[PDB]
Design a protein around this ligand. Sequence first.
Ligand SMILES: [Cl-]
Ligand SMILES: [Cl-]
Length: 135
Amino acid sequence: SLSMIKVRLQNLFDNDEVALLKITCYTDKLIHLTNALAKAVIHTIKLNGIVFVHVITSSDICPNNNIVVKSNFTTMPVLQNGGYIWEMMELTHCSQPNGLIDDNCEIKFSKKLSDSTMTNYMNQLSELLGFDLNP
Ligand SMILES: [Cl-]
Ligand SMILES: [Cl-]
């Protein structure tokens, strides 16, 4: 009853920096996870061993954080402490969802903010980076 997804990512401020996000969830929740990620901005925070992955989605259903059974975040190179925003380059559904995964990050789902200050921030950032964060 478990499914596994891996998402390949590249840093919008430095395309040489890449990351892999692996998530396991119950198969009946998989559709909510993929729909959420399809309409999502990916923002991460790192302070030493503590890593937070923010999935900020414009999907109709923003899933509950409890749909994640395990999550792993690995980067190349190893990143300095700080905050990051990522482009999703690839999404893969994996055979053998029960395989080993080192649980080393916390996933936080939230809804995109309709507030005009945040909208203006996301639109100007989109123009700076040449990538539409608010399509
Ligand atoms: Cl949707
Ligand atoms: Cl602003």
